[model samples]
Target: MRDPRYDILFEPVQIGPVTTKNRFYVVPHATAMGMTALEEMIAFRKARAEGGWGVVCLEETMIHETSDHAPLPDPRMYSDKYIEPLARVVAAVKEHGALAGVELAHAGASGPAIYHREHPLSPTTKYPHYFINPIAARTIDRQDIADFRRWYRDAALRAKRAGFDIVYVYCAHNLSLLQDFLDTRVNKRTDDYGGIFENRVRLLRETLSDVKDAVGDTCAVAVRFAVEDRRRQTNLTALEDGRRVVEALADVPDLWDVNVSDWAWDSGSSRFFEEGQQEPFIDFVKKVTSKPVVGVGRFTSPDAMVSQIRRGVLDLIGAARPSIADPFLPNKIDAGLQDDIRECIGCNACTAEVMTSSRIRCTQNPSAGEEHVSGWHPEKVPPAHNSDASILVIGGGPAGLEAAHTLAKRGYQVSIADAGSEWGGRLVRERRLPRLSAWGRVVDYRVGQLQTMPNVSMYLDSPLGADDVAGFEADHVIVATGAKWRGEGVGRNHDEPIPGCDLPHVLTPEDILDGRLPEGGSVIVYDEDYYYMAAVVADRLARAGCKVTYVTTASDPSPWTHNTLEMVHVVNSMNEAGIEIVVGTAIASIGPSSVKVSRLLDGRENEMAADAVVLVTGQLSEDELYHQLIAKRDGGLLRSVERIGDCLGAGQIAQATYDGRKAGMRYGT
Candidate 1:
């Protein structure tokens, strides 16, 4: 009973010598598994293909030694040694009738080569694009350019030998050497491969032709190009040079994988970007090229995906985050189970992990990156050994709901209760903050599923005590009472409370989220927890007519957000909101009318008038009920007492969901 509206999505699409079974394309995205974790990588890609993606693509694979991005675990195909391992990945994808693609890339200035100890290559001698190493990339001479072309050609042949259906000439995200040549700012050399648009694009054109020449007979050659840089620092734009390049080489590649430039803008969080945000920048690709066009906008909606195809904006539904959030998105849509699709919240938690050189993870899908390591499947879970057992979960938040749902799915009788009127625990209030409405999906999807299960019962505004838990006589008790922000100044900068932090005007993020509005006066948001909360609180207060000042111990406001790719957006958002930013500073003490701040580098003290001080510092677990229940568990009928999510330890939403799922899966063993 497939939805006829989505039937168009299942249509086959031609790409050079290969044809995909459908239009769902998982574009190149890092996993941190790389060549070192071959089994993990294969399992991750196989899951996507088995979930029904028409095209499952490998991440950026280095084509040469000079382009080695060490310490990041990027995959490699520079030699014959990689063919057997990569062939396993291709076999995993093709096993499910999906086309496998590999992005052969030379990192150029972006690659530090810290491990390889090779000098980086670039269009012009310049500093590394992302790394802060003191080394500079060597400007390529004519022979170097020829060697670069040969590297791509050799890599393309290896990809073909590894059974790849599509070979990619990566020139997007400002990460590739080929893209560095296209960038006017980066390519300042007065040579045949630099200067004017044609000369600058000469290297890319030659690389694309080389790749095609090497693998054209068997593999579909796709060009992942940035139609616009968006930052405007590059001369590439959809209007001028970007269009010219596409028009000039329209049919050179069989497929066009186009997007905006820089990884941040391309994979922007939902707080600052909406689905289809790249359409305006990439819609011109189909008009300029007769080849198939693919682009990403964090697409999660099936209707929006269909619209893109029907409106001629794109031929394939390109995805990175969406595919990571739910590998079964295409199959779910095709099976008329769109509601079951676990949508990406756009928190960038997955990107955050990869950026930190860890394995990928997702808030919505807890099984992500744990498929091979833990043998956890996103769509399947083992039934409980004792299916007739009964469980009582206290706390209707993320952890409690997830535990309850998972337990019930294992054919157990489950009951969950929350002290609050709504679900989502901390998110119940956090979602009300500015630009966090999309996070509500985490609660919506879980609650929606839990409601349909006959064996599960959910209750809100029903706080249960130890006596109540004992009276229920459940076999197991799971405490998922989430955490709360501390009003004290105890955090990264301080181990104890700041003077006057106990004043009546001083509050916590919980107070503000609970509708406690600070009086209309100057407010100082002291941030010791360097994440989104401090900046978000400042923005909220500023919008609420309070003059806001954001103070953080880190040199940058929300420095940890850089891992999530939201640091720039957060800074810009605060700046645009007219909030004063004070970095590298800490609140020395809070007073009646002002707070004394001290510079971290130099102990220079300064006073700022503050009618109220909001401490966005550390979080303490709300595990009081868990202790009380543990005390009574020995004398009661409680088979076991366990803590999950914030109840066990305070952390991010991704960690909370992951803990909840782990508790559910490992219960009764």
Candidate 2:
């Protein structure tokens, strides 16, 4: 019963000596599990392969010791010792009929090599690309270039021995040594390796040729290149140098995997970029090369994917975040169940975890990175031990809806209620803010699914109390009442309330999200949560004609957003909105017409005129109902009472969904 229009998607494609069963390609992406966690990597990739991806690719695997990115668990193929672990990964992917690929990379100056203490290698001596480590990469001479070629060939041989079907020559994301040599800004050499256009691209072309010589007979060689840097004053552009490189080496590789340079723009969040946003930048890739081309743009819509192929924009659909959100995306589409697909919200929570050097997690899919550790599957759940048991969930937010859906999937009769007219809890208002409409998918997916389940009943504008819960006589109760922001100005900087915070002019993030404006007065947005809320609120106020000043105790506004790769975008957005930024400052007290602030380093007091103050501070859980019910549980039908999500501990929506899923699965045990 698969849709006939999608039949073309399942067609076979040839790449060099290998052939893929379909066009669905899960391109290489970071996992933070690396080679050190072999079992985790196997389970992660295996799931995607089994889910029906035609090609499953591993993240950037180091090709030499100098590319050691410590604190980040990047996989390695620098020696024969890594062959066994990576071979296991290959076996898992091929077991499900998917071609396995590994991106062989040397990070060059992009890696600090702190763990190995080796001098980082680059075309010329320079500071590290992304970090502030007190060191510089040493300039590579002729011998180093020869050694680099040898390392690539050795890695390719190891990859072939490990049973990989596709070997990638990684030169994208501004993280590869080969890419640095291609850039005019980095390659400041007068030798044969670094002057003219052909010379600048010599290393990349040579490396690709070397990799092919090593494994060309059995493996399809793919080149991951950035057609455009999307950066100001950069040399690479889709039409100019970038296009020239492709034309010069048109048929060098079996497949062309192209995207924009830099990680942030390539994997931009839904807030800033939409689906198919990279099409304009990468459309000319297929024109220059006869090989199959794959590209990414956070694609989730089948129609958009079909357009790419039909319009000759790309030959294969490339995905990273979408595959992580729903590993079974291809299977679902093949089964004519595209409606069941768990599309990525593009919140970048997955990237945030990897950036923080933690295992991956997703807002839409909780089982991500838990496939091996928790043995949880995205599409399957165990039936309840006691299917006859009935449960009442108090709250219709993200956590409550998730719990209800999960319980119903386990064959339990479940009922859920919320105090508001709409679901989504905090998202009911937060989604209304600028650049966050995509976030509402958290509610839309669960709510749509729950509506079709026969064993679940949902209610809106139905507030429940301890007495009501006891009267319902359900087998158990789950409280997911969510949390609220504090208005007392008690946050990270101060455990106690600031003076004059109780005044009428003082507000919380909820006030701004709820459409309450300050009538064009000067407003101070005090950030203590150090996340997206503070910057988002400031933007909203500024758009409403309020002269906004963003103040934070940290040196940067929304410092935690750096993990989500939104720190720069957040700052840029605020600046464009004409909001004044004040860093390393704390709000001492609030007055009717002004607010007193002190510098964090020196404690120097300064006063700023403010008609209102919006506190983006800490939040407290609304778990009083759970406590009340626990006190009287012995007398009611409530066998047990549990708390999940913000009601237990205020955190991100990803945490809330994970907590709810855990509660549902562990209910009887």
Candidate 3:
């Protein structure tokens, strides 16, 4: 039995002027509640604080009012009369042992909600109508900056009275005032706050000083400035620059939430990046600040948390995806029942859902954002009603493991067997890549959890044949044999079976993950798949002292990059790691040690030496057992029988876990 006293995780930690109870924070992205529904927005933040978050951050609260003023950019100062509603949300978070903070920002030229919402605001306004151009930034007037400063002060005062713990001079991402100043390419101003580094950094400093003066000690001031500009381009923010920004802003801010930007770049998702890929960024950012720096890297394993905390890198383990997958993350860690924590698969479902302009979702934990509705809890294990009956589960991947634990928890005797000696089928292999050290934590957690349950029987090194199941005479059988990589080629309505990929240097993305980086002077990662596997390989190899080129079709990375996630930051990463990016190009064919390629935009052909042609095309699911056992057997083996996870094919962790939970819910007998 566990003592329930830890339920109220509201303990205060002293910042400069504010003290936050518990370290739980809900920094915003997007949620289901539309901007129109003030009550819904309030409830969302309030509920999270009540649930156990130490602080709740409002998502992209706009700092300036302009024609390009972002979609659903909730105003902090809506006519001064609207302060009550903002307070309403703040009061909700603070009520449950949590502090409330709002990130206020001006989205530069990117503010328009839809095309022609209104003229967007920047330091200048040369190109007012163009979506993303060099023109809108040419015009800068003194009055615009003055009006913005006034708006900043007003918003701060409103937030202070409304009960916010801190008011942010939000500058992180490409959405902050610092962005125009952060990027040399963008802010070509010669004024006091524009031309040079000091000038570029002036907007945040002035905003912070003014907001602090306006709010006084009633609220703490913070800044979440964009830190990573990827490559060393003109006016880009680097880790060193980020450190200087914080070091210079030193005493002004109560806390600093440092992160990189260009949503297309930073958000972790399978389509854009591999799991646990942001660790390097986290490590670098932690080096620059002493003001209790907060960072995120999709951590799921307790060991990873232990490592980060023990390593003295970050003050708090910030997680947007991990929290979405399992809201009770801190609780699970404290309980040492970490195996039960539903890990984020970095599939970007939450980001994808929001990018589609939808609400929150998760890859592994289906109940994410449904806590207000779903009665799901980590402690909700039912006693086995039929402990005497035996159950058989096929496959040893994520879905199989989840099914095994779930059925056993429901009081049924569960036995899980896989063909191989090792358990994590595809995911385990995927984790072997150089950058995915923490990814294995999900498998470790799940495997460890299953081991703790008495009714669950894990059969390692035991592969059960279809004919072998009848001998056990089980009451229920689950076929959770996971899915395989699609291996089909790129783009929509077309998946060509890449020809001549049998050469020694030519390998699929999965193969290269485990093997040594090809030893050569130069390599072209001819990625037609245009996904994380190839992108990660190219980045990793370049970091490992290889001159690598990322060749892909389309304007961006690939098809997945076109989704809700934006990898604009990745271009910076590729560029910095010395990974030459040849976008809008495709491989025509292979020639000895070279790959003949043609540009997608203009049919120009060129040849590049290929030390290794790694294709992120995906794998094949050996679902021979699933195909064999669906309904062929007698005694309703398929009824009580369950199928889940990638055994259904490589759909991702969300799909697999959802399948298992559904099976458990429907077959709770």
Candidate 4:
């Protein structure tokens, strides 16, 4: 039961006026349930605390109820009405050895959503900036500024009353009241609060100082601000400008949680993207401040953690995704059982799921949302399900292992069998592509935990034919058998080379993952796959020192970049590493060592020469096993089985794991 990693992880660390039992910090990420049903929000907070996180930083709490960037209710710190409930959550966190921190923000011209309803306010009526335009009658006056300051102080006092350990003056992530003032594009006032540097920061600076006075030293004062907006279109958010902003506030706040602008970085990459990809953007924060610095890189490695600390790069790592998958991280690492910890698959299913008003889920860990329902109490170890009944789990992948583990945990005997010698069906090839190392860890972790469960029986190299399943004659049966990758073949069918198809070197992504690389130096990766696979393949080849050219027929290379942080890393790496990037182009034909292409926008034809041609078009889902099971029997009391995952369709780890868990829990009774 001893662990080597826990020694450092369990060591207590003090933040401002608050101290954490462990170094782990659940820095805020949008749960999209800010103003959600109170019951659900409270349940969400309780889950984080129950999951053994050291601190749960609440999502952006607007200074005023109307100061929201989106319409769907977000968290709030501005009102005193939420004190009792907020305090209850805070108390729960403290009871569980975790600290509760709240973040407060002020929305600029972008009032919650881009477009405004009925009566528009001054910031909205005006140029959407808070520069207090002298020419505009709707510009905020000195009295307006005073009211704003009062609102901030009131919010801080409420936070204090709510028993929050840290109250943040949100200046980062384009949500801060001050961010609007700094933006000249939005600010047009020529008054003392505009046209000049000191004038612009006045309201924000004063708000900070006011909150500090209201809360006193009873709680830590923090600032979350974007130190830079890398997509610099104007002077409003350049790194140099960002440097000035951070430097100016260095002496005021106790901590600085730095990051970049836009919704992209906030939602990082999934299995298709790489881990720790945000380091470069977050690296510039140290140059502007002396206070403790914290940032996120979707960190999943202890070496990355140790490296960041060793280099004095960041005082703490803020991970929302990692914590979601492995809530018992500190305890697990402390026990030197890192491999036993459930890994996050970087799929934003957890984030995207909540957006759909659904419970959050982890691609790697299936027990996320149903923690309470599933009886997964982290501290109170459930009495082993001392039952004599046996269950048959018919696959060796994630779904199979999860089913086997749950059944065994419930005290049922479990027999797990797969066709392969080793577990991990898809991951064997997946991990070889991109930042899927953690994904590969999923099977390993499940296997490790299963090994500890005495009642479970593992079967490798066993073909799970329908006859094999029928002969089991078990008390209960669950099909963990996954589907095959045969795409719908709707628009484009299976990487076919229309007219110029006949070439031994032209191959599918499976070929590349199977260790088929062209001996030629230059390789053209034509992607019509429109998924993460193409990008993963492209990055793999680029890293292998090929003059990799990623030519995508899609408008953008990969829409998966919208969820994962690795998109930026992939783009930047390709740019600096000299990898050729051609977007909005398609292949006309594949000639020897080259592809004749035409730009979609202008029908302009161009030939891209290559030593090898790799086609990462996509995959098809094969449900041969499920169809067989259904064909074998149907109707009444039969307890029908369903097969999901890539075999069912092409999607993400989120969908696959979600289907497995849902199916398992549905029949668990």
Residues 1-669, model 3: lDDT tens digits? 223443333345565678776655556556645446665566555556644666667776665445323343354453566678777777777777677877766666655534334456666554533244333433547777887788889878877777778788877666655576656666767788777678878877888899888885778787776677653354454556666676677656777676666665567554356544655655665555556656666666656655666577665556676666666766665565544666666656577555545546565665554444443444355555656877788877767776776777777877888777677766677677655554565567678778887878888887777778766767777787765544334433236655555667765565555566677667777665554667778877777677888877757774564454646546666766778888788776765588887887779998888766765555456667765765456654544555666656565465676677666655644
Q: After superposition, how far is residue 10 of candidate 2 from its true place, in Å?
A: 0.7
Q: What is the lDDT of residue 243 in candidate 3?
A: 61
If the candidates were sorted by their TM-score against the true structure, best first, what order would they fall in? 1, 2, 4, 3
Question: Which residue pairs come into collision in candidate 1?
Answer: none
* Residue 426 CA displacement from its true place in model 2, Å: 1.3
Per residue, candidate 1 scores C-alpha lDDT tens digits across 596-655 of: 999989989999999989999889898887888777767636758899998798888898
Give each model's whole-structure lDDT.
Answer: 0.89, 0.90, 0.64, 0.67
**Model 2 error, position 292 (Å):** 0.6
What are the per-residue Cα lDDT tens digits for candidate 2 across 1-669?
799899989999999999999999999998899877888899899999989999999999999888966789988999899999899999999998999999998998898888687889889999989868887999998999999999999999999999999999988888999789988889898998898999999999999999999999999999999999865557888888889889999999999999999888889988688998899999888888989999998989988898899999999999999999999999998999989888898889999999888999998998899999888888789988788899999987789988998899999999999999998888899899988899999999899899898889888889987788888888888999999999998867788999999999999987888899899889999999998888888888999999999999999888888888788788788888889999999999899999999998999999999998999888999988898888877753576889999999999899999998999888887
| TM-score-best of 2 and 3 | 2
> lDDT score of model 1?
0.89
| Candidate 4 overall lDDT versus native | 0.67
Top candidate on lDDT is 2
TM-score of 1: 0.99
C-alpha RMSD for every candidate: 1.0, 1.1, 5.9, 5.3
